[PDB]
DNA sequence: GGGGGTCCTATAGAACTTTCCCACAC
DNA sequence: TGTGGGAAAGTTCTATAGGACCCCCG
């Protein structure tokens, strides 16, 4: 987002100001934070920061991963070898990461 | 000035990857 | 020249902070 997430202290401050029935304009003045942001925190504090964001995609498909492992499970070929063998177009390092993730 | 609202959009911050080192190995 | 691995920098993700743009009251 355009700004950082409300921290613990700024949420605690929001909290007590709410119990003191401070206006929103005034609240956003004292913590130098947009009203937009505060309004949403107070409407439902328990779920602030709660909604995950779908991540970027891995560089390798489940197939490619499975082939990479099969190649390394069998023989001592280098990561680079495997990458060229399955014409993989993912970094030599990524392959190693996959191999290492398989125990 | 005080108070309130709705909606566009650039980005935080995370997930994942790649680059860049390193001590070593041929 | 290469390796694999640790660290740091890059890429790629989308929910959300900012703030634009509305309103009314004294």
Short mmCIF file of C-alpha atoms (C1' of nucleotides) in Angstrom, two decimals:
data_model
loop_
_atom_site.label_atom_id
_atom_site.label_comp_id
_atom_site.label_asym_id
_atom_site.label_seq_id
_atom_site.Cartn_x
_atom_site.Cartn_y
_atom_site.Cartn_z
CA UNK A 1 0.00 0.00 0.00
CA UNK A 2 0.87 3.71 -0.26
CA UNK A 3 1.83 3.70 3.38
CA UNK A 4 3.16 1.25 5.96
CA UNK A 5 0.80 -0.93 7.93
CA UNK A 6 -0.48 0.45 11.18
CA UNK A 7 1.86 -0.85 13.91
CA UNK A 8 0.99 -2.18 17.35
CA UNK A 9 1.48 1.19 19.05
CA UNK A 10 -0.45 3.09 16.49
CA UNK A 11 -3.25 0.50 16.78
CA UNK A 12 -3.24 0.78 20.58
CA UNK A 13 -3.43 4.55 20.18
CA UNK A 14 -6.38 4.18 17.78
CA UNK A 15 -7.96 1.90 20.37
CA UNK A 16 -7.94 4.29 23.32
CA UNK A 17 -8.88 7.26 21.19
CA UNK A 18 -11.93 5.28 20.06
CA UNK A 19 -12.85 4.64 23.74
CA UNK A 20 -12.49 8.41 24.23
CA UNK A 21 -14.81 9.02 21.34
CA UNK A 22 -12.31 11.15 19.45
CA UNK A 23 -13.40 12.10 15.92
CA UNK A 24 -11.70 10.53 12.95
CA UNK A 25 -10.25 13.77 11.63
CA UNK A 26 -8.79 14.36 15.06
CA UNK A 27 -7.53 10.81 15.34
CA UNK A 28 -5.76 10.99 12.02
CA UNK A 29 -4.21 14.31 13.08
CA UNK A 30 -2.72 12.88 16.29
CA UNK A 31 -1.23 9.81 14.60
CA UNK A 32 -0.48 11.41 11.23
CA UNK A 33 -2.27 8.65 9.42
CA UNK A 34 -5.05 8.82 6.83
CA UNK A 35 -8.67 8.60 7.96
CA UNK A 36 -9.25 5.87 5.33
CA UNK A 37 -6.75 3.77 7.20
CA UNK A 38 -8.04 4.30 10.77
CA UNK A 39 -11.74 3.88 9.79
CA UNK A 40 -11.05 0.44 8.48
CA UNK A 41 -8.89 -0.53 11.44
CA UNK A 42 -11.58 0.51 13.96
CA UNK A 43 -14.55 -0.97 11.95
CA UNK A 44 -12.98 -4.40 12.46
CA UNK A 45 -9.69 -4.42 14.45
CA UNK A 46 -9.46 -8.19 15.06
CA UNK A 47 -9.01 -8.69 11.31
CA UNK A 48 -6.56 -5.91 10.54
CA UNK A 49 -3.72 -7.37 8.52
CA UNK A 50 -5.53 -10.68 8.32
CA UNK A 51 -6.19 -11.20 4.65
CA UNK A 52 -3.34 -12.92 2.73
CA UNK A 53 -2.19 -11.93 -0.78
CA UNK A 54 -1.76 -14.66 -3.38
CA UNK A 55 2.01 -14.91 -3.94
CA UNK A 56 3.97 -14.88 -7.19
CA UNK A 57 4.35 -18.23 -9.00
CA UNK A 58 7.26 -20.58 -8.54
CA UNK A 59 9.69 -20.79 -11.46
CA UNK A 60 9.10 -24.49 -12.00
CA UNK A 61 5.93 -26.51 -12.54
CA UNK A 62 5.10 -29.52 -10.35
CA UNK A 63 6.17 -31.59 -13.37
CA UNK A 64 9.54 -29.86 -13.75
CA UNK A 65 10.10 -30.13 -9.99
CA UNK A 66 9.27 -33.89 -10.18
CA UNK A 67 11.65 -34.42 -13.12
CA UNK A 68 14.40 -32.44 -11.42
CA UNK A 69 14.12 -34.70 -8.37
CA UNK A 70 14.03 -37.90 -10.48
CA UNK A 71 17.24 -36.83 -12.25
CA UNK A 72 19.02 -36.08 -8.95
CA UNK A 73 17.58 -39.11 -7.12
CA UNK A 74 19.19 -41.36 -9.73
CA UNK A 75 22.59 -39.90 -10.63
CA UNK A 76 25.22 -37.42 -9.48
CA UNK A 77 24.79 -34.89 -12.27
CA UNK A 78 25.38 -31.21 -11.48
CA UNK A 79 22.47 -28.81 -11.06
CA UNK A 80 23.53 -27.10 -14.30
CA UNK A 81 23.49 -30.49 -16.06
CA UNK A 82 19.90 -31.14 -14.95
CA UNK A 83 18.83 -27.64 -16.06
CA UNK A 84 20.17 -28.27 -19.57
CA UNK A 85 18.94 -31.87 -19.61
CA UNK A 86 15.32 -30.86 -19.04
CA UNK A 87 15.94 -27.57 -20.89
CA UNK A 88 14.50 -25.92 -17.79
CA UNK A 89 14.97 -22.13 -18.13
CA UNK A 90 15.10 -21.62 -14.35
CA UNK A 91 18.32 -20.63 -12.57
CA UNK A 92 20.90 -23.27 -11.68
CA UNK A 93 20.38 -22.12 -8.07
CA UNK A 94 16.61 -22.70 -8.17
CA UNK A 95 17.19 -26.28 -9.25
CA UNK A 96 19.46 -26.73 -6.22
CA UNK A 97 16.78 -25.19 -4.03
CA UNK A 98 14.31 -27.80 -5.30
CA UNK A 99 16.79 -30.64 -4.79
CA UNK A 100 17.46 -29.40 -1.22
CA UNK A 101 13.72 -29.07 -0.46
CA UNK A 102 13.35 -32.83 -1.12
CA UNK A 103 15.44 -33.69 1.96
"C1'" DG B 1 -13.24 25.68 10.64
"C1'" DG B 2 -15.55 21.48 12.49
"C1'" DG B 3 -17.59 16.72 11.26
"C1'" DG B 4 -18.71 12.78 7.82
"C1'" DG B 5 -18.29 9.71 3.42
"C1'" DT B 6 -16.53 6.75 -1.48
"C1'" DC B 7 -13.31 5.19 -4.77
"C1'" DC B 8 -8.52 5.04 -7.85
"C1'" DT B 9 -3.91 3.58 -7.68
"C1'" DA B 10 0.99 3.06 -6.33
"C1'" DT B 11 3.10 0.28 -3.25
"C1'" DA B 12 4.60 -2.60 1.30
"C1'" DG B 13 5.89 -6.51 2.35
"C1'" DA B 14 5.79 -11.25 1.47
"C1'" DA B 15 6.88 -15.25 -1.41
"C1'" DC B 16 10.07 -16.89 -4.61
"C1'" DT B 17 14.19 -16.41 -7.75
"C1'" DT B 18 18.44 -14.80 -9.22
"C1'" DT B 19 22.87 -12.73 -8.60
"C1'" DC B 20 26.90 -12.63 -6.31
"C1'" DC B 21 30.09 -14.29 -3.36
"C1'" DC B 22 32.88 -18.08 -1.19
"C1'" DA B 23 36.24 -22.10 -0.35
"C1'" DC B 24 37.22 -25.55 -2.73
"C1'" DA B 25 37.58 -29.13 -7.04
"C1'" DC B 26 38.68 -30.50 -11.49
"C1'" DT C 1 36.95 -22.83 -15.55
"C1'" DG C 2 33.64 -25.45 -12.65
"C1'" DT C 3 30.91 -26.86 -8.13
"C1'" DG C 4 27.16 -26.22 -4.14
"C1'" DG C 5 25.70 -23.07 -0.48
"C1'" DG C 6 25.15 -18.55 2.33
"C1'" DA C 7 23.80 -13.75 1.73
"C1'" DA C 8 22.04 -10.07 -0.65
"C1'" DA C 9 19.45 -8.06 -4.42
"C1'" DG C 10 15.73 -8.71 -7.77
"C1'" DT C 11 11.14 -10.16 -9.24
"C1'" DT C 12 6.40 -10.68 -8.74
"C1'" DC C 13 2.50 -10.86 -6.33
"C1'" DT C 14 -2.38 -7.94 -4.41
"C1'" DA C 15 -4.71 -5.76 -0.19
"C1'" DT C 16 -4.51 -1.65 1.16
"C1'" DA C 17 -2.61 3.47 2.74
"C1'" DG C 18 -2.99 7.74 0.83
"C1'" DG C 19 -5.38 11.09 -0.43
"C1'" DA C 20 -8.40 12.80 -4.31
"C1'" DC C 21 -12.99 14.06 -4.45
"C1'" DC C 22 -17.71 14.24 -2.46
"C1'" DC C 23 -21.18 15.93 1.46
"C1'" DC C 24 -23.44 18.74 5.91
"C1'" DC C 25 -23.16 21.90 10.19
"C1'" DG C 26 -22.25 26.30 12.81
#
